[PDB]
Design a protein around this ligand. Structure first.
Ligand SMILES: [Mg+2]
Ligand SMILES: [Mg+2]
Ligand SMILES: [Mg+2]
Lengths: 481, 478
């Protein structure tokens, strides 16, 4: 009804909150006729005005979008994830939960409830849709109707109170490889490496202790190991009492890289150490024998402007992340890195790969690029959060190409789709929401994966602008069954 | 889907086609907290691309919007009316019916099916939502869920194959007063005056013959008569054979006004005759004894640029319609009019009234105005102005929506059951054609010139629609 007129709820970040459907979206160009599957993605979209006018972008209720590809057509469906939070607040007609990860600010009537918004990532696994939020269990939804079934503990087997929003699909076993931090509640060092079978059964839950009380947003998975990047993005229960942001980045502490053998336990966990820095999303990780590589954008401080963290406000240059490879060797002695190498020389984030090569050696990556040299002619703030360029890098040659969306548009996280099951690596398509911030229309744009610089080959033209979201995923129709 | 790259499907007329919901719309200003009820309106929104790319605006599947007012909040729900046409075309994944009102261009698989889109008007009556399209029966929908129940013949009693999209609610009996043209199929002169009880039972269906086969889009109802305006917007099977537009306006033929006593039959119907002209929507009609008045915009030719008719291309000057009163006297001899007089000197359409005075003497009317002297900063006939006229004085006031926006049909809401005439609110969709957002604006009915007192901010632009109506919550089954 009356949302606050802070920048977080105005302009390009105005509330959307519409659930709905479009059958057979308008197409410009030609949807590749063989494509048959689902593209899911999610954005935060507070159902009601927040209890705090300072509410973080990442605190809004998860709105799940589905784009079903088939027969040269794409259909649109969008629904709220009906978390425990969402259900109870709808019955009340108002917001009951408080600030980001701060149960102290919750209403008395919802104390002890799962506070998750399921607003970070959505992925098909075991015939169902996993809607994920770091601080809460995994929420199960129907991949096609987007009905919510509820939080899962995987048949009572999973002990961890939380479930990450960045699982990886082992390309051999089909297992869902995930992890959890704060596994025994907020401010607990408890961790866990998790694998879920292709039928949804919990196969393993390996606990271990983290070096910090810190955010563990993403991780890497290789053929033999799980890779945990630890940066001092620290949590403070004291700060929640002072109604200050849960997370604060400490520039003085080192970063760690923990390698866990996937068939071992906490005793086999080796920690390597490197200099202070801020680590972003993992493009991919793989191991060559005992040599472990993980690729991710690295910056000197927080790179996400909408992520309200404790300390000095968002420093734009310090927040520039560059795709970087970290290399460690399990056969070595000590905790030293073998190598750190910058893979791409333009500020980037939201990396993606050909998922058929997840956890293995690879060369093709796609990413959103921040090109501050381009004009931006859209009123409504959001200049620092502007990802206006789509990039492709060939890691085997260092060659790259990119596409600028123009002075009115932003681009959301891309996603690769193979041309066929046995196509060469990176042969196929990249899709991404291209949002026009003047006309307020969103196109699901389809690029040739190997020629993104040529611009979209097809655009699914929505009569609505989809709010800036987070992560999404493609699933072939063969996975629905 | 690949829709045509024509103006009829581009820019401000791009397809929308989204069904969906918004709980508790964003409000700017204050929604009058006493209001509890529903605002329904509908727009054409072809589910799939047409079989012929010259497809008319009026041929698109009906998309029904609901704004449910309650305790200072407004919720949004929008659903397709699931006509027989819509259902079968969805099953086929494509358009099967052809050009506007042209069964010869239909696919063989939908021969004989009802071709209606239920895209013209939506109104609550007898606890249900009547979704109407001239060429087809009335479609029954649920007023709150917008689920479609199907076409009705009112328990098999109604003989007419068609049902108008401009019924009036008699303010005394509560009956739904309607009519039909082409009542025995396309090209048939058969007409019918229809009344339906407040519980949905057919109370009367009075047949008669029209002076020629023409569009009979709107009509008037007074205390004692039904009033039918006849203009030579003609159709012929020949034009359908030549793949030409169903309707063609003949500037050489006269217009008629047929007055039917509401408790009589075809023999009591009196026809009056006047000069050629194009008649628009009816603001209201009433009779003072045998003196019958009907108010409506009148123009030299077609006033709707989105209406493709046969002849010369759209002439905007000829299409300027001005609210005009026609008067006839049932006590007179012959077919002469008593007079015709212009009530408002600015091009206008989509007239509305305090419907508590429908069929009766009245003075307050609201309208959309085409103010061509104002700027427009976006890439035909633009209704950029909302007007209020006091017919007892000729005084008027208006509100310009600004250089980015247009306005859709308004609708009056009384401040309370005992409020005097025109005391209350006027609501209308105000559409921003640059940002592509629509607001449901609420004006003070007697001071529209002050601008909205409240705006329900939608995160989407509602496509140009047609007619809608307000219904107090008390008229719904609880
Ligand atoms: Mg009216
Ligand atoms: Mg004006
Ligand atoms: Mg308009």
């Amino acid at each position: 009804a009356h949302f606050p007129q802070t920048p977080g709820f105005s302009g390009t970040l105005r509330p959307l909150r519409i659930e709905g459907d479009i059958l057979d979206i308008e197409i410009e160009g030609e949807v590749p006729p063989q494509l048959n599957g689902t593209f899911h993605r999610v954005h935060p979209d507070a159902q009601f005005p927040p209890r705090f006018e300072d509410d973080q972008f990442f605190n809004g209720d998860g709105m799940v979008s589905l784009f079903r590809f088939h027969d040269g057509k794409i259909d649109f469906r969008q629904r709220y994830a009906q978390t425990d939070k969402w259900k109870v607040e709808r019955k009340a007609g108002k917001s009951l939960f408080g600030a980001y990860r701060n149960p102290l600010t919750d209403d008395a009537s919802v104390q002890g409830m799962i506070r998750g918004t399921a607003n970070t990532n959505v992925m098909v696994h075991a015939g169902k849709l996993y809607a994920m939020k770091e601080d809460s269990p995994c929420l199960i939804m129907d991949p096609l109707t987007l009905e919510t079934e509820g939080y899962t503990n995987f048949d009572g087997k999973l002990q961890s109170q939380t479930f990450c929003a960045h699982p990886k699909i082992d390309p051999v076993t089909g297992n869902l490889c995930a992890f959890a931090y704060g596994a025994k509640g907020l401010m607990t060092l408890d961790m866990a490496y998790i694998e879920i079978s292709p039928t949804g059964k919990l196969l393993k839950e390996i606990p271990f202790q983290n070096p910090y009380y810190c955010m563990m947003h993403d991780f890497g998975v290789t053929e033999d190991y799980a890779v945990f990047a630890v940066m001092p993005l620290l949590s403070s229960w004291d700060r929640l009492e002072q109604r200050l942001p849960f997370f604060g980045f400490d520039t003085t502490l080192p970063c760690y890289l923990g390698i866990l053998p996937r068939n071992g336990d906490a005793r086999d966990l080796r920690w390597f150490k490197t200099g202070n820095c801020f680590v972003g999303h993992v493009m991919n990780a793989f191991n060559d024998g005992t040599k472990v590589h993980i690729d991710m954008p690295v910056s000197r401080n927080n790179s996400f402007p909408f992520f309200d963290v404790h300390g000095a406000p968002f420093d734009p240059v310090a927040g520039q992340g560059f795709l970087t490879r970290w290399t460690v060797d399990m056969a070595s002695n000590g905790d030293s890195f073998e190598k750190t190498e910058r893979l791409f020389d333009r500020p980037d984030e939201f990396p993606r790969i050909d998922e058929r090569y997840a956890t293995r050696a690879y060369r093709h990556g796609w990413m959103l690029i921040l090109d501050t040299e381009k004009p931006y002619e859209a009123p409504g703030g959001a200049f620092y959060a502007l990802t206006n360029t789509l990039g492709h890098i060939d890691l085997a040659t260092g060659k790259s190409s990119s596409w600028w969306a123009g002075p009115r548009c932003a681009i959301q996280e891309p996603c690769f789709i193979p041309r066929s099951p046995d196509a060469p690596e990176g042969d196929g398509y990249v899709i991404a929401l291209v949002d026009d911030h003047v006309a307020n229309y969103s196109d699901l744009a389809i690029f040739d994966a190997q020629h993104v610089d040529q611009g979209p080959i097809a655009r699914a033209k929505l009569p609505v602008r989809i709010r800036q979201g987070l992560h999404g995923n493609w699933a072939d129709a063969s996975r629905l069954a």
